[PDB]
Amino acid sequence: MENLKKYLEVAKIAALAGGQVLKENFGKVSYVDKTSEERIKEVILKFFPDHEVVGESEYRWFIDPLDGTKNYINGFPIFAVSVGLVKGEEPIVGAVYLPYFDKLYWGAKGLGAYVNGKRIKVKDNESLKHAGVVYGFPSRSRRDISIYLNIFKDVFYEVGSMRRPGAAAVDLCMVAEGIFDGMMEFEMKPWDITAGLVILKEAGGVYTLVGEPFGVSDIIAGNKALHDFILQVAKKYMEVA
Amino acid sequence: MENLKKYLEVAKIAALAGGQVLKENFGKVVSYVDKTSEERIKEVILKFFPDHEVVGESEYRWFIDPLDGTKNYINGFPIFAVSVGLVKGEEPIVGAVYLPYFDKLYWGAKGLGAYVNGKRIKVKDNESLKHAGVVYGFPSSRRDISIYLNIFKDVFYEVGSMRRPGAAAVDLCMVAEGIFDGMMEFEMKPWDITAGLVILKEAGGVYTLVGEPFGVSDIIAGNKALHDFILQVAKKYMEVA
Amino acid sequence: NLKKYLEVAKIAALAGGQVLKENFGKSYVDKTSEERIKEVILKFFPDHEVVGESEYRWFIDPLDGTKNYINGFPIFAVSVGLVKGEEPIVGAVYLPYFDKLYWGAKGLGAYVNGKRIKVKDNESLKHAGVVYGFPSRSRRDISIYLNIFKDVFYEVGSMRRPGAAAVDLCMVAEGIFDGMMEFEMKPWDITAGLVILKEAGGVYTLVGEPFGVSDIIAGNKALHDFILQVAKKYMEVA
Amino acid sequence: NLKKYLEVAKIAALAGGQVLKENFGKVFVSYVDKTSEERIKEVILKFFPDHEVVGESEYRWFIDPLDGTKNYINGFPIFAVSVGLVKGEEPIVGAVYLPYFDKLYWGAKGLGAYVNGKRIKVKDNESLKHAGVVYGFPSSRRDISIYLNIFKDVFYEVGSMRRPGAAAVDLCMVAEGIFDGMMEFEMKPWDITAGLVILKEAGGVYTLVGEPFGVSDIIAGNKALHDFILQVAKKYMEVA
Numbered sequence: 001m002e003n004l005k006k007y008l009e010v011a012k013i014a015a016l017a018g019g020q021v022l023k024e025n026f027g028k029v030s031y032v033d034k035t036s037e038e039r040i041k042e043v044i045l046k047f048f049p050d051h052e053v054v055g056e057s058e059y060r061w062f063i064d065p066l067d068g069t070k071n072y073i074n075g076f077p078i079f080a081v082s083v084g085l086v087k088g089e090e091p092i093v094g095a096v097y098l099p100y101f102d103k104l105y106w107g108a109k110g111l112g113a114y115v116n117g118k119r120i121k122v123k124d125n126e127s128l129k130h131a132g133v134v135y136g137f138p139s140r141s142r143r144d145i146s147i148y149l150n151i152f153k154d155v156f157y158e159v160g161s162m163r164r165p166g167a168a169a170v171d172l173c174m175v176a177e178g179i180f181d182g183m184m185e186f187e188m189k190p191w192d193i194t195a196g197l198v199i200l201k202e203a204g205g206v207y208t209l210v211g212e213p214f215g216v217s218d219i220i221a222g223n224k225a226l227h228d229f230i231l232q233v234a235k236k237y238m239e240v241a
Numbered sequence: 242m243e244n245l246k247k248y249l250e251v252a253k254i255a256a257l258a259g260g261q262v263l264k265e266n267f268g269k270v271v272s273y274v275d276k277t278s279e280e281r282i283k284e285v286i287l288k289f290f291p292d293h294e295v296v297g298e299s300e301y302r303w304f305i306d307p308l309d310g311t312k313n314y315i316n317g318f319p320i321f322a323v324s325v326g327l328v329k330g331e332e333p334i335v336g337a338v339y340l341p342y343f344d345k346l347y348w349g350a351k352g353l354g355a356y357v358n359g360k361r362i363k364v365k366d367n368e369s370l371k372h373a374g375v376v377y378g379f380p381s382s383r384r385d386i387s388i389y390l391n392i393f394k395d396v397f398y399e400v401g402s403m404r405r406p407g408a409a410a411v412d413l414c415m416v417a418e419g420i421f422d423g424m425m426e427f428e429m430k431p432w433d434i435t436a437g438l439v440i441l442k443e444a445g446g447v448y449t450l451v452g453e454p455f456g457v458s459d460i461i462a463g464n465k466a467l468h469d470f471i472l473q474v475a476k477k478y479m480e481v482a
Numbered sequence: 483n484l485k486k487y488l489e490v491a492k493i494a495a496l497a498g499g500q501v502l503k504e505n506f507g508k509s510y511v512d513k514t515s516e517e518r519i520k521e522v523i524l525k526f527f528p529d530h531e532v533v534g535e536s537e538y539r540w541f542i543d544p545l546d547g548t549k550n551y552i553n554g555f556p557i558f559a560v561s562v563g564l565v566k567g568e569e570p571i572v573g574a575v576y577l578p579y580f581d582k583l584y585w586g587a588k589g590l591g592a593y594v595n596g597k598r599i600k601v602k603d604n605e606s607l608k609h610a611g612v613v614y615g616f617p618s619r620s621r622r623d624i625s626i627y628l629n630i631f632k633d634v635f636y637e638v639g640s641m642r643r644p645g646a647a648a649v650d651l652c653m654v655a656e657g658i659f660d661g662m663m664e665f666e667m668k669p670w671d672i673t674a675g676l677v678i679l680k681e682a683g684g685v686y687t688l689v690g691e692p693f694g695v696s697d698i699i700a701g702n703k704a705l706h707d708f709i710l711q712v713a714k715k716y717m718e719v720a
Numbered sequence: 721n722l723k724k725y726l727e728v729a730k731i732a733a734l735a736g737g738q739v740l741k742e743n744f745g746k747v748f749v750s751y752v753d754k755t756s757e758e759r760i761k762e763v764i765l766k767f768f769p770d771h772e773v774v775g776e777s778e779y780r781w782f783i784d785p786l787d788g789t790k791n792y793i794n795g796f797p798i799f800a801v802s803v804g805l806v807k808g809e810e811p812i813v814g815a816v817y818l819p820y821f822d823k824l825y826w827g828a829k830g831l832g833a834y835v836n837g838k839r840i841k842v843k844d845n846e847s848l849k850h851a852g853v854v855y856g857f858p859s860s861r862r863d864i865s866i867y868l869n870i871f872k873d874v875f876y877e878v879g880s881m882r883r884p885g886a887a888a889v890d891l892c893m894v895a896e897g898i899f900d901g902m903m904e905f906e907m908k909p910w911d912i913t914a915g916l917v918i919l920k921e922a923g924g925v926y927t928l929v930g931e932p933f934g935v936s937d938i939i940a941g942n943k944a945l946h947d948f949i950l951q952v953a954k955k956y957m958e959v960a
Contacts, residue, residue, distance in 0.1 A: 156381050
């Protein structure tokens with residue numbers, strides 16, 4: 001933690017470096033996915049050769065060169081680059097950049113959560129009918145779809161509104177910014193969420209990780225209210241330990 | 242209707258009138274906004290055409306949506322719009338939809354084409370389902386939710402991706418713009434889709450309206466491929482006539 | 483009908499600005515623009531008069547920054563101002579590229595997209611920023627403007643020539659620039675901007691014939707007094 | 721190795737631009753400038769430890785942490801970060817970032833000039849009366865008159881003349897085809913080196929009067945305007 005602030009500024013530059021690849025290529029197009037990754041990898045390693053990078057010790061950078069690929073290929077502006085860092089098992093730094101909006105979300109353990117310099121935080125709201133929730137799950141799941149459909153139906157009925165933007169890292173950043181009350185994505189990878197979670201926690205959010213935090217996981221995050229409720233419902237059709 | 246041109250130009254201005262209310266109030270944590278936007282629109286339309294009828298909540302009928310995507314707008318999510326559509330008798334002839342946050346004005350008129358801020362648009366060519374992008378939306382409902390979950394899962398298994406942005410007028414413009422192959426909206430009002438529908442049609446899109454075009458309806462629109470696919474699936478779980 | 487003239491001015495500017503927006507990066511524009519502006523105005527106030535290249539006059543610039551617009555420089559706007567008798571009371575200046583709408587009305591304050599604005603404070607002249615402008619083929623001798631330019635140049639921190647008076651007035655109003663100096667002006671290029679600047683707590687002096695060819699010196703008290711100080715040394719005033 | 725120098729350059733500009741970006745509007749200055757400078761110099765030296773950084777060997781980087789300082793402090797969006805690479809005495813790499821507009825101009829010798837992954841080129845001109853020129857000079861080492869005379873003669877011939885207040889950005893707008901040319905006096909290497917590479921690869925022409933790596937005056941634009949505003953200059957200050 002002696003160079004936490006140096007890790008942060010490096011995470012931010014890495015996200016921007018790969019975010020520029022997404023920027024220059026938007027609307028023109030998978031070579032982008034690899035070019036963004038190389039750039040991110042280059043920045044991290046030149047600064048910290050010894051660290052390990054994961055995607056696709058005591059310092060593991062979990063990166064997502066392009067979160068929201070399908071949206072990116074179709075032209076839907078909800079996509080980003082995610083750059084998270086974890087010491088041992090503890091996630092300590094997060095950087096998520098939204099190229100199309102030129103919005104850079106970031107945060108470090110105990111240092112706060114920000115978006116382009118402005119401090120952010122999850123919103124205050126108990127009321128479920130006044131709440132907004134984003135969600136997401138795969139098309140060819142490892143788990144039966146019906147389960148996800150049943151969980152959806154239950155929250156959908158109590159919540160004020162639900163949205164499926166198509167990019168976990170962004171969903172995580174909008175919850176941390178106080179736009180959406182909570183989220184719930186299933187069958188996630190560490191690089192999909194690591195950076196976003198750090199930011200969410202620093203913005204004062206709560207979250208339950210189901211499964212191996214660095215393997216395949218499920219995530220239920222948001223303010224106190226939605227987290228407990230999405231979690232309650234989430235365990236009627238599946239198991240949590 | 243020799244004034245199509247004038248009708249179009251008025252629709253656009255009116256959408257800009259209401260959109261201005263939506264943009265300068267965005268972010269300011271009661272929906273006096275919606276009422277004010279509506280007031281500006283009705284006002285513009287009725288100074289140019291005093292005898293035309295304006296619908297939303299007698300040969301020419303203007304269907305207007307002062308605020309498509311209320312939930313998103315309140316929460317701080319960019320996907321919201323204002324729609325202004327003109328119907329002569331029964332035929333939709335002019336459409337204008339404005340995305341204030343993006344300062345994007347989608348417009349079109351019968352036989353004159355579809356446009357977005359000056360550039361001509363059109364639906365995409367692809368007929369491959371696994372590559373297709375689809376947007377959907379059903380309310381939280383008049384009919385049993387199971388029906389929507391059933392139509393969703395099926396399409397979900399075939400298409401490349403599915404999104405729920407939360408504002409039908411925008412879903413229609415993005416389909417018209419060729420970002421999404423198709424859209425799927427259930428239990429709509431005429432002022433939710435009339436404008437976006439004119440636009441979609443001029444972009445070369447195909448669509449199926451279920452129920453009374455000027456009463457509660459369901460809309461399935463997109464390129465040929467997706468419209469044929471979504472419609473066929475829907476017909477397995479619900480009635481269309 | 484005070485709050486009503488303002489809403490119409492805003493919609494009129496937006497209407498004309500939309501034309502500029504659709505064609506940016508390509509006079510049909512200028513013509514089409516004023517066409518939309520006068521049309522919206524006369525639809526809401528058939529008794530009012532429109533002017534712009536009856537106790538209620540609207541001075542409009544369908545496209546301020548024509549040259550910038552043609553080159554692809556983002557500095558350009560639409561200007562819609564209203565005068566009652568001889569007093570500027572309502573103004574709207576829209577900048578299509580930045581999607582920023584500046585508006586104001588006597589007693590109601592100045593705004594830019596729903597945000598209230600005000601001119602800036604100045605303690606040191608060498609910290610001030612000034613925007614200026616004069617024509618290439620001018621009625622006055624360029625020597626006069628060069629003298630005015632130097633004197634002001636040596637005293638302030640910076641001087642900029644953006645190319646759109648209507649936009650210069652607005653930037654002084656928002657407190658980006660301490661003040662401006664624009665010479666050989668027409669009423670439709672500055673009326674809407676003046677209303678906005680004054681409601682932003684600004685000061686200004688018109689030289690010549692308002693609603694005619696004039697000069698304009700505007701900004702916070704400090705720069706206005708200084709720019710006017712210099713001007714008086716090389717030319718006519720009152 | 722040009723390709724690797726260019727990618728690094730873009731990143732360096734972006735990094736320093738981020739500082740400028742998250743501090744724009746917040747009425748300090750030395751802090752932003754210095755913080756931006758430190759981030760740019762760090763990235764460069766990280767990929768090329770042997771290179772030399774300059775501004776305020778066989779491979780020198782001329783960087784401007786914040787071009788358009790006064791504009792930046794005032795809140796006028798015309799400002800940027802300039803990162804240029806020089807091999808020997810020749811400008812070979814250039815990256816100019818405009819944080820506010822989120823536009824990144826870039827180029828490398830023999831590779832072309834771009835803006836956010838968009839190939840750019842100077843505009844074609846015929847009539848001087850249709851030309852647009854950006855100018856600028858310090859408040860100076862030469863008698864203002866000299867510059868005012870040059871400005872005056874050009875002013876009389878072209879359609880328009882603007883003074884945005886940021887050389888780096890100026891050179892990029894000429895490269896993009898917005899302005900036909902620009903004249904700027906009393907320049908430093910870090911102010912124009914990046915823009916120069918970008919301009920030249922956009923098919924532009926420029927003349928450096930003075931010491932390229934010292935204090936200099938720059939005449940740059942397409943062929944037309946460059947020749948024209950070069951004629952006028954040597955009519956008042958006698959370029960070599």
